[PDB]
């Protein structure tokens, strides 16, 4: 599944960003964070087309409404990261973990929106599989690696 692998490699990037936040990870300082923000935004735009296609192959008054909501969130988060990374690149070039916090917060927001988009896409594809167009996408509820939900604790 293209959606799953794209979102999950972005999750790898977003893990490396939190690891820099904890102060011990594969990124030395702000410049690595700026580069990571740029690539996570690019992968978010790719995710944006994947969501666009799954939405376009869906009936109107269907799960496509939530999916388009999450896609619009994705678009704002990716755009904020690209301009903010350009801003902080310029600031570094002229003159900062505090600076890294804005990019990391935007990345957290984007990753949360991407998780929401992933589950929305899965529901849209499963619910309307043998509707025409979705078959061409060939997303048969198995390419999605959906675990069974784990049982609740009876006593808390």
């Amino acid at each position: 599944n293209d959606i799953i692998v794209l979102a999950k490699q972005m999750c790898m990037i977003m893990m490396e960003m939190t690891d820099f936040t904890r102060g011990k990870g594969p990124l030395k300082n702000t410049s690595d964070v700026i580069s990571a923000a740029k690539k996570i935004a690019e992968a978010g735009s790719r995710m944006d087309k994947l969501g666009r296609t799954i939405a376009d192959h869906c009936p109107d008054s269907a799960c496509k409404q939530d999916l388009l909501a999450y896609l619009q969130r994705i678009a704002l988060y990716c755009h904020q990261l690209n301009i903010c990374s350009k801003v902080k690149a310029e600031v570094q070039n002229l003159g900062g973990v505090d600076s890294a916090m804005s990019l990391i917060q935007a990345a957290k927001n984007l990753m949360n929106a991407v998780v929401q988009t992933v589950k929305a896409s899965y529901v849209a594809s499963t619910k309307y599989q043998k509707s025409q167009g979705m078959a061409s996408l060939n997303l048969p509820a198995v390419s999605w690696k959906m675990k069974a939900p784990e049982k609740k604790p009876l006593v808390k």
């Binding site: 619009q72 678009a75 704002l76 529901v123 939900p149 609740k152 009876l154 006593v155």
Partner: protein, 370 residues
């Protein structure tokens, strides 16, 4: 090929698969809608949140319960709740699993009929069934005899069952449950200067009630103790760091179950209702009903409610009787556990309402099959 079990309570949705021993989805049965001004582009496209989605964002939402008192009042929000349950929480396709649903007794027939219709026509379930929650509690308790006192967010009901036979004339329903206690606690928290008005603040007060409230074994000595000392006062930290202290609101709020006149109701307490239900049963089954007082539901989860329950029923019943209150530790999910026991039963598989029968006989099939 595996049945689903959705326990639609007034407060929480308990959903899972028949055969399992615990629900896999337990989320609030609320739908939230934004009530403020969306000022960022794309951040206001989602117009409705369901379940934990709404409790997470409840600071900018208006939370609504589709079910009051066990009757579904909003059929478009409940429909959203069910869509969430099937697709986002359980992640199944409803048209392959038969679905077991639960309902309180003495409930409008249109409720059950419209549940049948929504299942069979919006979710295309192959079969469905509507079971009474107290019978399911007795299933989960491993008995076939006993009187069940089930209290949830919306309704408290007493169903006496003997050897698998219910006595429907002795069933008692009382529209006083967890949400009424939450409202009463919001009301009496104002005596200390704490004002919780919003629906989100109602969720905060529900949390306060679940964490701090308990049932006094003897109400008057507890009031005297709270007046004399400050030993019963406990603190609670609000979501923004303010700390509130409540002394006798802790046992005054649950006392409304035994003194419904606290909230202006004329009915009898749950002990009196239980006794009155036992005394509408045949004299030969009363001894076995006294000894099996199954308590289920989340409103029976107060510390000390079983002790007070037994003390009051012992006062009411004859002195030679055998009063036992059965309060399992997991009784917050007894209805779901019994529903999964029943839906997995081998002898139950001819008792589903198949979609063929629905197509023959309309939604009215549910009153004669169930």
């Amino acid at each position: 090929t595996t049945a689903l079990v959705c326990d639609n309570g007034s407060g929480l949705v308990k959903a899972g698969f028949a055969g399992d021993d615990a629900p896999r989805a337990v989320f609030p049965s609320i739908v939230g809608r934004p009530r403020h001004q969306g000022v960022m582009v794309g951040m206001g496209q989602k117009d409705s949140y369901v379940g934990d989605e709404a409790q997470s964002k409840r600071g900018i939402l208006t939370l609504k319960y589709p079910i009051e008192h066990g009757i579904i009042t909003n059929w478009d929000d409940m429909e959203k709740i069910w869509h969430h349950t099937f697709y986002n929480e359980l992640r199944v396709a409803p048209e392959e699993h038969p679905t077991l649903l639960t309902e309180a007794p003495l409930n409008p027939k249109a409720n059950r009929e419209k549940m049948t219709q929504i299942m069979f026509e919006t979710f295309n379930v192959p079969a469905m069934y509507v079971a009474i929650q107290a019978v399911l509690s007795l299933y989960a308790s491993g008995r076939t005899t006993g009187i069940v006192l089930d209290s949830g967010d919306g309704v408290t009901h007493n169903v006496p069952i003997y050897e698998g036979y219910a006595l429907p004339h002795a069933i008692m329903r009382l529209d006083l449950a967890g949400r009424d206690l939450t409202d009463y606690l919001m009301k009496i928290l104002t005596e200390r200067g704490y004002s919780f008005v919003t629906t989100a603040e109602r969720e905060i007060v529900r949390d306060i009630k679940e964490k701090l409230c308990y049932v006094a074994l003897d109400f008057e000595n507890e009031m005297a103790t709270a007046a004399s000392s400050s030993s019963l006062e406990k603190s609670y930290e609000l979501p923004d760091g303010q700390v509130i202290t409540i002394g006798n609101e802790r046992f005054r709020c649950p006392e409304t179950l035994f003194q419904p006149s606290f909230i202006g109701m004329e009915s009898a307490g749950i002990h009196e209702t239980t006794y009155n239900s036992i005394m509408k049963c045949d004299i030969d089954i009363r001894k076995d009903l006294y000894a099996n007082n199954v308590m289920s539901g989340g409103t029976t989860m107060y510390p000390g409610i079983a002790d007070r329950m037994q003390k009051e029923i012992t006062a009411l019943a004859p002195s030679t009787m055998k009063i036992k209150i059965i309060a399992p530790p997991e009784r917050k999910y007894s209805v779901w556990i019994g529903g999964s026991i029943l839906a997995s039963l081998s002898t139950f598989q001819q008792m589903w309402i198949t979609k063929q029968e629905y197509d023959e006989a309309g939604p009215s099939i549910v009153h004669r099959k169930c």
